[PDB]
Design a protein around this motif. Sequence first.
Motif, short mmCIF file in Angstrom:
data_model
loop_
_atom_site.label_atom_id
_atom_site.label_comp_id
_atom_site.label_asym_id
_atom_site.label_seq_id
_atom_site.Cartn_x
_atom_site.Cartn_y
_atom_site.Cartn_z
N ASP A 272 42.81 29.71 40.55
CA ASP A 272 43.90 29.74 41.52
C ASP A 272 45.15 30.30 40.85
OD1 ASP A 272 42.40 28.63 43.65
OD2 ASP A 272 43.02 26.56 43.10
N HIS A 275 45.37 34.13 40.77
CA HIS A 275 45.32 34.86 42.03
C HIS A 275 46.20 36.11 41.94
CE1 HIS A 275 45.30 35.90 46.22
NE2 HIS A 275 44.34 34.99 46.42
N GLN A 280 50.07 33.10 46.35
CA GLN A 280 48.81 32.43 46.60
C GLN A 280 48.47 31.49 45.45
OE1 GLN A 280 47.04 31.90 49.34
NE2 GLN A 280 48.83 32.98 50.12
N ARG A 281 49.16 31.65 44.32
CA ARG A 281 49.04 30.75 43.18
C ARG A 281 49.74 29.44 43.51
NH1 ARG A 281 51.35 35.58 39.35
NH2 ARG A 281 49.79 37.08 40.05
#
Length: 298
Positions: A272, A275, A280-281
Amino acid sequence: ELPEDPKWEFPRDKLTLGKPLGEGCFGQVVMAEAVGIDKDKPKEAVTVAVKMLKDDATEKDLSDLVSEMEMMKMIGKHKNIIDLLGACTQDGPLYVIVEYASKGNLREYLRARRPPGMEYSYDINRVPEEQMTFKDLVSCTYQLARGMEYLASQKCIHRDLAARNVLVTENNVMKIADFGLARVINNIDYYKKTTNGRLPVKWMAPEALFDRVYTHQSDVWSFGVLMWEIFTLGGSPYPGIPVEELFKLLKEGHRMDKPANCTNELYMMMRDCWHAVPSQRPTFKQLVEDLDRILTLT
Ligand SMILES: */C=C/C(=O)N1CC[C@H](n2nc(C#Cc3cc(OC)cc(OC)c3)c3c(N)ncnc32)C1
Protein backbone atom coordinates in the motif's frame (compact mmCIF):
# COMPACT_ATOMS: atom_id res chain seq x y z
CA GLU A 1 28.89 34.87 11.35
CA LEU A 2 26.40 33.05 13.58
CA PRO A 3 23.67 34.95 15.52
CA GLU A 4 23.49 33.89 19.19
CA ASP A 5 20.52 31.83 20.38
CA PRO A 6 20.69 32.07 24.20
CA LYS A 7 18.12 29.33 24.87
CA TRP A 8 20.13 26.73 22.92
CA GLU A 9 23.71 27.95 23.46
CA PHE A 10 25.94 25.66 25.54
CA PRO A 11 29.31 26.74 27.04
CA ARG A 12 32.40 25.16 25.43
CA ASP A 13 34.22 24.81 28.78
CA LYS A 14 31.52 22.31 29.80
CA LEU A 15 31.93 20.05 26.75
CA THR A 16 34.73 17.49 26.38
CA LEU A 17 35.18 15.67 23.06
CA GLY A 18 36.02 11.96 22.99
CA LYS A 19 36.27 9.33 20.25
CA PRO A 20 34.88 9.58 16.67
CA LEU A 21 31.65 7.62 16.29
CA GLY A 22 31.96 6.43 12.68
CA GLU A 23 31.24 8.95 9.89
CA GLY A 24 29.44 8.17 6.62
CA CYS A 25 25.77 8.37 7.60
CA PHE A 26 25.53 11.51 9.74
CA GLY A 27 28.70 13.44 8.83
CA GLN A 28 31.61 13.80 11.26
CA VAL A 29 30.25 12.92 14.70
CA VAL A 30 32.17 12.46 17.97
CA MET A 31 31.34 11.25 21.48
CA ALA A 32 31.49 13.90 24.20
CA GLU A 33 30.59 14.72 27.80
CA ALA A 34 28.53 17.83 28.57
CA VAL A 35 28.14 18.98 32.18
CA GLY A 36 24.72 20.47 32.94
CA ILE A 37 23.17 20.03 29.48
CA ASP A 38 20.54 17.66 30.89
CA LYS A 39 18.24 19.94 32.87
CA ASP A 40 16.71 16.91 34.64
CA LYS A 41 20.12 16.30 36.27
CA PRO A 42 21.89 19.69 35.98
CA LYS A 43 25.06 18.71 37.84
CA GLU A 44 25.65 15.40 36.05
CA ALA A 45 28.09 14.87 33.17
CA VAL A 46 25.89 13.41 30.43
CA THR A 47 27.16 11.49 27.39
CA VAL A 48 26.21 13.16 24.11
CA ALA A 49 27.16 13.25 20.44
CA VAL A 50 28.62 16.25 18.65
CA LYS A 51 28.41 16.94 14.94
CA MET A 52 31.12 19.25 13.62
CA LEU A 53 32.80 20.20 10.36
CA LYS A 54 35.83 18.19 9.22
CA ASP A 55 39.19 19.68 8.26
CA ASP A 56 38.16 19.08 4.64
CA ALA A 57 34.77 20.76 5.14
CA THR A 58 33.22 22.61 2.19
CA GLU A 59 31.30 25.89 2.27
CA LYS A 60 28.05 23.93 1.77
CA ASP A 61 28.91 21.70 4.75
CA LEU A 62 28.79 24.79 7.00
CA SER A 63 25.38 25.95 5.72
CA ASP A 64 24.04 22.36 5.84
CA LEU A 65 25.10 21.94 9.48
CA VAL A 66 23.41 25.26 10.34
CA SER A 67 20.25 24.22 8.44
CA GLU A 68 20.11 20.83 10.19
CA MET A 69 20.43 22.61 13.56
CA GLU A 70 17.64 25.10 12.79
CA MET A 71 15.55 22.25 11.34
CA MET A 72 16.05 20.35 14.61
CA LYS A 73 15.12 23.51 16.55
CA MET A 74 11.83 23.97 14.69
CA ILE A 75 10.81 20.28 14.61
CA GLY A 76 10.57 19.97 18.40
CA LYS A 77 11.01 17.07 20.81
CA HIS A 78 9.63 13.56 20.26
CA LYS A 79 10.56 10.12 21.61
CA ASN A 80 11.33 8.74 18.15
CA ILE A 81 13.15 11.79 16.82
CA ILE A 82 16.80 12.50 17.71
CA ASP A 83 16.81 15.44 20.12
CA LEU A 84 18.81 18.65 19.89
CA LEU A 85 20.40 19.15 23.30
CA GLY A 86 22.38 22.31 22.52
CA ALA A 87 25.01 24.05 20.38
CA CYS A 88 28.26 26.01 20.40
CA THR A 89 28.00 28.85 17.88
CA GLN A 90 30.39 31.57 19.10
CA ASP A 91 34.18 31.99 19.42
CA GLY A 92 35.27 28.71 17.86
CA PRO A 93 34.10 25.78 15.67
CA LEU A 94 30.39 25.07 15.25
CA TYR A 95 29.30 22.22 17.53
CA VAL A 96 25.76 20.82 17.33
CA ILE A 97 25.04 18.64 20.36
CA VAL A 98 22.55 15.78 20.02
CA GLU A 99 21.20 12.79 21.97
CA TYR A 100 23.60 9.85 22.23
CA ALA A 101 22.47 6.52 20.70
CA SER A 102 24.80 3.78 21.93
CA LYS A 103 23.66 1.04 19.53
CA GLY A 104 24.32 2.97 16.31
CA ASN A 105 22.11 3.11 13.22
CA LEU A 106 19.22 0.71 12.56
CA ARG A 107 20.87 -1.00 9.57
CA GLU A 108 23.95 -2.08 11.56
CA TYR A 109 21.79 -2.83 14.62
CA LEU A 110 19.61 -5.26 12.65
CA ARG A 111 22.59 -6.70 10.73
CA ALA A 112 24.36 -7.55 14.00
CA ARG A 113 21.20 -9.36 15.13
CA ARG A 114 20.96 -11.47 11.94
CA PRO A 115 21.50 -15.29 12.22
CA PRO A 116 25.15 -16.47 11.93
CA GLY A 117 25.80 -17.34 8.28
CA MET A 118 23.69 -14.63 6.68
CA GLU A 119 25.29 -11.75 4.76
CA TYR A 120 26.58 -8.84 6.87
CA SER A 121 26.14 -10.82 10.10
CA TYR A 122 28.68 -9.99 12.83
CA ASP A 123 28.97 -10.32 16.60
CA ILE A 124 29.48 -6.88 18.21
CA ASN A 125 32.28 -7.17 20.80
CA ARG A 126 32.67 -10.74 19.49
CA VAL A 127 29.58 -11.60 21.56
CA PRO A 128 26.32 -12.64 19.80
CA GLU A 129 23.36 -10.25 19.97
CA GLU A 130 20.08 -11.68 21.29
CA GLN A 131 17.77 -12.40 18.36
CA MET A 132 15.16 -10.00 16.99
CA THR A 133 11.69 -11.32 17.75
CA PHE A 134 8.69 -10.52 15.57
CA LYS A 135 7.34 -8.18 18.26
CA ASP A 136 10.69 -6.31 18.26
CA LEU A 137 10.53 -5.62 14.52
CA VAL A 138 6.89 -4.48 14.67
CA SER A 139 7.74 -2.31 17.70
CA CYS A 140 10.64 -0.86 15.70
CA THR A 141 8.23 -0.27 12.80
CA TYR A 142 5.60 1.35 15.05
CA GLN A 143 8.06 3.73 16.75
CA LEU A 144 9.27 4.92 13.34
CA ALA A 145 5.68 5.36 12.17
CA ARG A 146 5.05 7.49 15.28
CA GLY A 147 8.15 9.57 14.55
CA MET A 148 7.09 10.24 10.96
CA GLU A 149 3.54 10.96 12.13
CA TYR A 150 4.97 13.72 14.33
CA LEU A 151 7.26 14.98 11.55
CA ALA A 152 4.35 15.12 9.10
CA SER A 153 2.27 17.06 11.64
CA GLN A 154 5.14 19.54 11.97
CA LYS A 155 4.65 19.98 8.21
CA CYS A 156 8.12 18.57 7.51
CA ILE A 157 9.39 16.23 4.78
CA HIS A 158 12.44 14.08 5.59
CA ARG A 159 13.22 13.06 1.97
CA ASP A 160 15.81 10.45 3.05
CA LEU A 161 14.02 7.97 5.31
CA ALA A 162 16.17 4.84 5.63
CA ALA A 163 17.55 2.47 8.29
CA ARG A 164 20.97 4.08 7.83
CA ASN A 165 19.37 7.35 9.01
CA VAL A 166 17.71 5.85 12.08
CA LEU A 167 19.60 5.78 15.39
CA VAL A 168 19.05 3.32 18.24
CA THR A 169 19.55 4.06 21.94
CA GLU A 170 20.64 1.78 24.80
CA ASN A 171 16.99 0.95 25.61
CA ASN A 172 16.30 0.12 21.94
CA VAL A 173 14.34 3.31 21.22
CA MET A 174 14.16 4.18 17.52
CA LYS A 175 15.26 7.74 16.72
CA ILE A 176 14.80 9.25 13.25
CA ALA A 177 17.87 11.30 12.29
CA ASP A 178 19.80 12.93 9.42
CA PHE A 179 17.72 15.99 8.49
CA GLY A 180 20.17 16.89 5.71
CA LEU A 181 17.54 16.96 2.96
CA ALA A 182 14.60 17.70 5.27
CA ARG A 183 12.37 20.64 4.31
CA VAL A 184 9.47 22.56 5.90
CA ILE A 185 6.69 22.76 3.32
CA ASN A 186 3.08 23.94 3.17
CA ASN A 187 -0.07 22.00 2.25
CA ILE A 188 0.80 21.88 -1.46
CA ASP A 189 3.63 19.74 -2.87
CA TYR A 190 7.31 20.72 -2.65
CA TYR A 191 8.49 21.69 -6.14
CA LYS A 192 11.55 23.61 -7.34
CA LYS A 193 12.44 24.54 -10.94
CA THR A 194 16.12 23.90 -10.16
CA THR A 195 16.52 20.12 -9.85
CA ASN A 196 19.17 18.45 -7.72
CA GLY A 197 19.25 14.64 -7.52
CA ARG A 198 20.67 14.15 -4.01
CA LEU A 199 17.97 11.66 -2.97
CA PRO A 200 18.81 7.90 -2.81
CA VAL A 201 17.02 6.24 -5.73
CA LYS A 202 15.92 3.02 -4.01
CA TRP A 203 13.99 4.93 -1.32
CA MET A 204 12.39 7.54 -3.56
CA ALA A 205 8.71 7.59 -4.53
CA PRO A 206 8.17 7.66 -8.35
CA GLU A 207 6.72 11.19 -8.29
CA ALA A 208 9.90 12.25 -6.47
CA LEU A 209 12.01 10.73 -9.26
CA PHE A 210 9.92 11.50 -12.35
CA ASP A 211 7.92 14.63 -11.44
CA ARG A 212 10.46 16.14 -8.99
CA VAL A 213 7.71 16.77 -6.42
CA TYR A 214 7.63 15.75 -2.75
CA THR A 215 4.76 15.34 -0.27
CA HIS A 216 4.24 13.52 3.04
CA GLN A 217 2.98 10.65 0.86
CA SER A 218 6.47 10.35 -0.63
CA ASP A 219 7.90 9.79 2.85
CA VAL A 220 5.31 7.02 3.20
CA TRP A 221 6.82 5.36 0.12
CA SER A 222 10.21 5.51 1.83
CA PHE A 223 8.63 4.10 5.01
CA GLY A 224 7.57 1.08 2.95
CA VAL A 225 11.22 0.63 1.96
CA LEU A 226 12.19 1.09 5.62
CA MET A 227 9.70 -1.64 6.59
CA TRP A 228 11.35 -3.89 3.99
CA GLU A 229 14.78 -3.11 5.47
CA ILE A 230 13.53 -3.84 9.00
CA PHE A 231 11.95 -7.20 8.15
CA THR A 232 14.97 -8.32 6.10
CA LEU A 233 17.16 -7.40 9.10
CA GLY A 234 18.94 -4.58 7.25
CA GLY A 235 18.81 -6.06 3.75
CA SER A 236 19.64 -4.06 0.62
CA PRO A 237 16.39 -3.07 -1.21
CA TYR A 238 15.84 -4.34 -4.76
CA PRO A 239 18.44 -7.15 -4.24
CA GLY A 240 20.62 -7.85 -7.29
CA ILE A 241 19.08 -4.91 -9.17
CA PRO A 242 21.53 -2.02 -9.86
CA VAL A 243 20.28 1.54 -9.25
CA GLU A 244 20.56 2.24 -12.98
CA GLU A 245 17.94 -0.34 -14.00
CA LEU A 246 15.42 0.69 -11.31
CA PHE A 247 14.40 3.81 -13.26
CA LYS A 248 12.87 1.53 -15.92
CA LEU A 249 11.45 -1.07 -13.51
CA LEU A 250 9.44 1.38 -11.38
CA LYS A 251 7.68 2.60 -14.54
CA GLU A 252 6.98 -1.03 -15.50
CA GLY A 253 5.53 -1.45 -12.00
CA HIS A 254 8.22 -3.47 -10.21
CA ARG A 255 7.90 -3.96 -6.45
CA MET A 256 9.99 -5.90 -3.91
CA ASP A 257 9.03 -9.46 -2.95
CA LYS A 258 7.71 -10.21 0.55
CA PRO A 259 10.37 -10.51 3.30
CA ALA A 260 10.18 -13.97 4.89
CA ASN A 261 10.15 -12.46 8.41
CA CYS A 262 7.08 -10.45 7.43
CA THR A 263 3.39 -11.36 7.69
CA ASN A 264 0.94 -10.96 4.79
CA GLU A 265 -0.80 -8.16 6.70
CA LEU A 266 2.43 -6.17 7.09
CA TYR A 267 3.61 -6.80 3.52
CA MET A 268 0.20 -5.55 2.37
CA MET A 269 0.87 -2.39 4.39
CA MET A 270 4.22 -2.27 2.56
CA ARG A 271 2.55 -2.71 -0.84
CA ASP A 272 0.00 0.00 0.00
CA CYS A 273 2.91 2.30 0.90
CA TRP A 274 4.26 1.51 -2.59
CA HIS A 275 1.16 2.67 -4.48
CA ALA A 276 2.07 4.56 -7.67
CA VAL A 277 -0.60 7.20 -6.96
CA PRO A 278 0.49 9.11 -3.78
CA SER A 279 -3.01 9.82 -2.42
CA GLN A 280 -3.71 6.07 -2.57
CA ARG A 281 -0.96 5.41 -0.01
CA PRO A 282 -1.95 5.48 3.71
CA THR A 283 -1.06 8.41 5.95
CA PHE A 284 1.34 8.00 8.89
CA LYS A 285 -1.62 8.50 11.25
CA GLN A 286 -3.30 5.55 9.52
CA LEU A 287 -0.05 3.54 9.55
CA VAL A 288 0.25 4.16 13.31
CA GLU A 289 -3.30 2.96 14.03
CA ASP A 290 -2.76 -0.29 12.11
CA LEU A 291 0.68 -0.98 13.60
CA ASP A 292 -0.85 -0.31 17.04
CA ARG A 293 -3.48 -3.03 16.55
CA ILE A 294 -1.03 -5.54 15.05
CA LEU A 295 1.44 -4.99 17.91
CA THR A 296 -1.40 -5.39 20.45
CA LEU A 297 -2.27 -8.86 19.11
CA THR A 298 1.35 -10.06 19.48
C1 LIG B 1 27.10 5.55 8.92
C2 LIG B 1 27.15 5.40 10.44
C3 LIG B 1 27.71 6.66 11.21
O1 LIG B 1 28.20 7.65 10.64
N1 LIG B 1 27.59 6.55 12.55
C4 LIG B 1 27.01 5.34 13.23
C5 LIG B 1 26.38 5.87 14.48
C6 LIG B 1 27.21 7.08 14.84
N2 LIG B 1 26.30 8.14 15.32
N3 LIG B 1 25.84 9.19 14.63
C7 LIG B 1 25.07 9.87 15.45
C8 LIG B 1 24.43 11.03 15.08
C9 LIG B 1 23.93 11.94 14.78
C10 LIG B 1 23.25 13.13 14.38
C11 LIG B 1 21.95 12.98 13.88
C12 LIG B 1 21.22 14.09 13.48
O2 LIG B 1 19.96 13.90 12.99
C13 LIG B 1 19.20 15.07 12.69
C14 LIG B 1 21.82 15.36 13.59
C15 LIG B 1 23.12 15.51 14.09
O3 LIG B 1 23.68 16.75 14.18
C16 LIG B 1 22.97 17.72 13.41
C17 LIG B 1 23.84 14.39 14.50
C18 LIG B 1 25.02 9.27 16.64
C19 LIG B 1 24.38 9.53 17.80
N4 LIG B 1 23.61 10.61 17.86
N5 LIG B 1 24.50 8.73 18.86
C20 LIG B 1 25.32 7.62 18.77
N6 LIG B 1 25.96 7.36 17.57
C21 LIG B 1 25.79 8.19 16.55
C22 LIG B 1 27.99 7.50 13.59
